[PDB]
Symmetry: D2
Amino acid sequence: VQPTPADHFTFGLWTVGWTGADPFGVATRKNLDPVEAVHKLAELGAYGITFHDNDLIPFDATEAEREKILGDFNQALKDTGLKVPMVTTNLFSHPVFKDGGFTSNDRSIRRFALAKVLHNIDLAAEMGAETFVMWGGREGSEYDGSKDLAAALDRMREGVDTAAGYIKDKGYNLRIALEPKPNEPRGDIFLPTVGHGLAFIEQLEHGDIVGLNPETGHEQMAGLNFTHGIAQALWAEKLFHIDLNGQRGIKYDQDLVFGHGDLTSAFFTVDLLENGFPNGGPKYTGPRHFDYKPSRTDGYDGVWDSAKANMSMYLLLKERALAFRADPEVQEAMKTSGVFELGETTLNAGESAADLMNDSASFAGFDAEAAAERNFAFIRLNQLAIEHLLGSR
Amino acid sequence: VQPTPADHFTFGLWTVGWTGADPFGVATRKNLDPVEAVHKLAELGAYGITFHDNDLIPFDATEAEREKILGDFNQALKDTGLKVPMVTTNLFSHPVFKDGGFTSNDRSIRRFALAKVLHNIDLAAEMGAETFVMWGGREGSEYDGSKDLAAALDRMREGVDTAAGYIKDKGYNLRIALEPKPNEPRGDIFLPTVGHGLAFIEQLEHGDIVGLNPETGHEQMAGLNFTHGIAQALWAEKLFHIDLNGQRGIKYDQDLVFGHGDLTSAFFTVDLLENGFPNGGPKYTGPRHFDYKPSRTDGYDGVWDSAKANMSMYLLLKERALAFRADPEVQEAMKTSGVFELGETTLNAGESAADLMNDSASFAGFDAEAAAERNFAFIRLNQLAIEHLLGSR
Amino acid sequence: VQPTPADHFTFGLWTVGWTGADPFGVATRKNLDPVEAVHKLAELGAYGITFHDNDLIPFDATEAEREKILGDFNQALKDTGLKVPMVTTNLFSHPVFKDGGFTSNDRSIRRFALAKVLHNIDLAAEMGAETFVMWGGREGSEYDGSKDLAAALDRMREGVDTAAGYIKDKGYNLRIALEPKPNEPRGDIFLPTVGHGLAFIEQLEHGDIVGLNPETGHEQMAGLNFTHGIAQALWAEKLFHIDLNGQRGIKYDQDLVFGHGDLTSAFFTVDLLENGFPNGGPKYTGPRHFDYKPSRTDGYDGVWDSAKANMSMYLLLKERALAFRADPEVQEAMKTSGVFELGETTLNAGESAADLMNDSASFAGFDAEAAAERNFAFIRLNQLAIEHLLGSR
Amino acid sequence: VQPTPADHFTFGLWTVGWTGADPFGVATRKNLDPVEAVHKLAELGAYGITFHDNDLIPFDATEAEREKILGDFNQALKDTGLKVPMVTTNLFSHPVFKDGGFTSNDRSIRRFALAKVLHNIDLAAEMGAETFVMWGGREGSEYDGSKDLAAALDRMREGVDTAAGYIKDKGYNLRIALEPKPNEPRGDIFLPTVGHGLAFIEQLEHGDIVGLNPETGHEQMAGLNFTHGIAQALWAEKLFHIDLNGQRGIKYDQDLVFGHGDLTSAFFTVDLLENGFPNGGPKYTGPRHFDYKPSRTDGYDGVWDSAKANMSMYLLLKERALAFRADPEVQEAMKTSGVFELGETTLNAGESAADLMNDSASFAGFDAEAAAERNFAFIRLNQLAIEHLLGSR
């Protein structure tokens, strides 16, 4: 497992920089200087860094302060060669955003939130980022009568189309990536899953540059299959970015290291990212980003250790996933289970609906009881998969 | 609570007809004659009945048998005046469908499944049904390598576009309604939630007549907010049908009577169906269908009792939900929380992105700390809602 | 709904004083003075107030500071008449308790957590509290190999039995109540549910004075039936205190107002607290403590509103629950479903196991098919409860 | 992976013989003959076979039939050498147990369920079983007012203590093991987790011979940590038997092959069964029983494949788990994280509660801020386990 910048492993400033405050306690770690994060990450083999506007530039920063911080940060980047592929906006920590940014009930707050986004598109464009992520963490409610739900989607759309229009207008080479989360910090968050994110994009005026940024753990907080969810994003050609982390069930957002949650699911996500679909189709080509948090029990050792562990796990999974598809025994099991058979169209070329109702062999004389005896042998194909994952074969 | 056919309460044949077999035991109730179901339902105040092709016509039925059953069933309908607003296909109980219907890995099975659908579109059209529901219960997997996930969506699309093309072609006044379910009977089901159902429809050639049929309990098995999910379907103008039942958490599909699961969520769904959105927008206008199962502990009493309980609960919720919006105290609390305020566009008419970045009052001189002092008073608006639900006020 | 001090409504200092920082944001409210909490709680109708040592006395407070704080506090108590029924210790906020208090892997942190508990028992005695609550919030792990799981329970026992021997040696009139939680802030918390808590107590040397403190939301984070769990606690005569709140599903601890989560479960929880068991048995007669958090979207008017709403909600449910059991149609429905029949012993007085084996009418001569026809009528019985809850009956 | 009879791999008749009916469909496989199950299990390397009375003897079987069935069965056992380590009773399939066995509201069903249990104890004795398992699958409710919850536990106690007195009076060398399940087939099952099961046993008269039978998937249906739950059972010396399988989340009981659910948890479960506790303590030495279902998509080649896969999976995990603990880098990592340190008593030999209170270096003179700097290094320790599990180390 030796990462290299050709792997395209990206990390957020807030990931290794997470200080350790959770809702039951305060920080266990001192703040991390952004110059050091950049240097350290570059020596680990990372390809780039990502930040929320306020991870770097304090909310209340004066202009002299802002310029100093960017000079320092631009210095570090020049020095190490790290790229800045994604930039996002913090529309959830200041008290002003307690009801949302884009979908706040207070109209003045909505205006400030959108203004804040627009300024950050400029920053992102100047840093050379290709993706602009939107995570609407405070968009939602605890109680069902708190919102007009139709107006909430209208407001949402208005903010996202305004940002997309501005990108088009300014000539910037950026795409927006929506990032779904079912709950936390709100009781219910708007556009809860990958499916709801895809759906909403189809109702936008400038939806052509608006896509998804799915996060492992987020999908798993509604108990969904991450791999199935990104497969649908990919099939719609909307998988613009990916956030990899780990979660161990339906509960608070854990943000563990990728592979430290549901392991078999992590193996099949790697397989999908690396091998694509068995019958061919689109392949994911962007950065492999890690939006995790080093457990608060661990000191600064642990922070670089956990950063190292993300890349190790991905690499270890990749090696196994490549060995798995290369295996001749796995290819035969795949043919036997009908994996390649699923890729053949149901209908024969130029055969219509009426033509099919009409074929006797297809319905009226179809031997249903005889077709039902097929042994799909999915258990054995899963056993082969697990034995490659364990490095048994 | 006195239902009347003007309420548009519909029930499936398989709902009151559910015999009681679950995966740990056999039936506790004798089979229900479809003629009696129709008569009984008509005396309760139901508006119509719905069935799966095989709920009525046995899989192996000869043609003389098929004609007899339809004559009996058409007799009963003529006699009672009951309508048949929705018809669906059973693509999950016979052993042939163990891997799916439309997305089975075996191509011959896919062909039979689609042929079976096409024949059932004819039946539906002859019964005067307006909606054709598709529930893909066996479309999915237990194991991640069992399917090419892209090919599975291609196959799915091919089956649904073929059915839609056939409706268009035949001149039938029917619309397809996809019905999402996260899991059970498979480990993971394709198009798990309302969001995934909406998304998939946008990738179809004939998506204009393809919409959703969300079920209360299905959304709640992924822990989502039913009311938020149908609000998005409504906003996209894709809420073609609705299945009401109850569920008490993330676990097996319980199918309890509507209102016998999450009660406050049942109240806000009724409010949405009855009152629409606070600021106006689309309103749901079809049948209120109940896809529940009378608990197996209860005898034939209980079966009509539980059918009666569905309509009672809906009516009782409706009365409370109407009282709630009519209340002057509730309207003031609503104004105070910014519910109507959310309906105002963020931007002023003909104000662009650049115009907003540029307004000083919106960003550079916006007093964030002062805007953050607003008391949204969402707890009190929720207390008013609950006190109307309990018939306290 | 007019709460009075014999209702035994007690509130934590940390509930109304919760300022609003969650894991994605900053406090939204100004700190609340302890003297001002006592005055407000007492005016609203509360009977008592509870606290965590560090809620009242800063962790850093000098001895001088300690004594000053306790004088104003005791003065307010004296001026208002509020009791202090339960006191608890903070073994979770300071960075030192990052791997736990009693089960920390570091031996010198275990002794410091235990010494902090012992000093807090002297303060509990001093304030006249009858219950000392233990929430082991940091006792657990993110990863399975972090702990020797046998040792962790041995260290948990050592702490609780040391503390209990100290009560007994000092002759304080005080009981220990453990408070289970499945997760958050740890991935997995030890003694995660009522059941684990009850079992663990049977392994203690001093178990006689150790009981439970179940919290609504906590059991509902594992998808358990809170009425059923507190019924089991009560049946073992181990329900020493109770914490009431709201939770809308399997997700982060929400701490809503009691009744703003699962409404029907809250109804049945109030029925067990107030009415006890249909056939007679134990009754819980301690205080009704509200361990919740005023939503961060709301100002101080919401804070006092939310405190008032907990009380209101319990009183509305109480009156509906009393009306429900008093109702003769409900009592007949109960009779029909066999609620009273379950109260009869299975064996006749003096019947041995050998006797029943050998009794031909209970096995050999048993008509199982006839017995299976019984209509338990559980659906009609549930419909009667909801109708009563909706104030329709 | 070459399983042999000293591995103590036992299998239920109902697992491989599970024909495939779920709640949405019909059996997909032909019945499996009991004599043929014994021959196949024995050839594959199993050590024993287990059954439910009705798995082997039809509920209707005449006495003539009974004796015939038991002769071919005993003959196969004799020919193969397979033991019969555990026997259980079916108190869930026949319509008569629709409201339970031992806790049915109907008194004559309670006596019939108890008499069926007593007769089954004579058969258990007769086959040389050491454990009699009790799964109370129908003991529970859909609705909260269906039962008097105190009475239900009293009726559950009566049944288990009657049965245990019968063992003791007859001097059978047999222990009772209760098997918890949170839900399915009931909405809420009584004694839903390891914890509730352990607590309930402490209320019995004959508790000394009553223990638990935890099942992987069952605790994982409430989102609990299975290693942590069986650790608590083991710590109380109550782990009498164990049922191993796979579950991918909070949903319907899947009964996958052991290792095809949560892989990292299975790894740590094998470590506790085989290796026990890091600091020494109790060890479980009973049989490793596989209570799972061969996926319905597969034919008989899948059935024998799946039985083989359970064994393989346990043996691959066993070898990786042994390699993992033997590894000196892992032993040093363990030392660094304080795994061995937790094994030391908090108090010094002879130290009283008063002593520690009064010891200035454990409280007053404690540097909490210094103690909080410790790097527990739990993330690196988890990375070492996964690397070992992936056969990388």
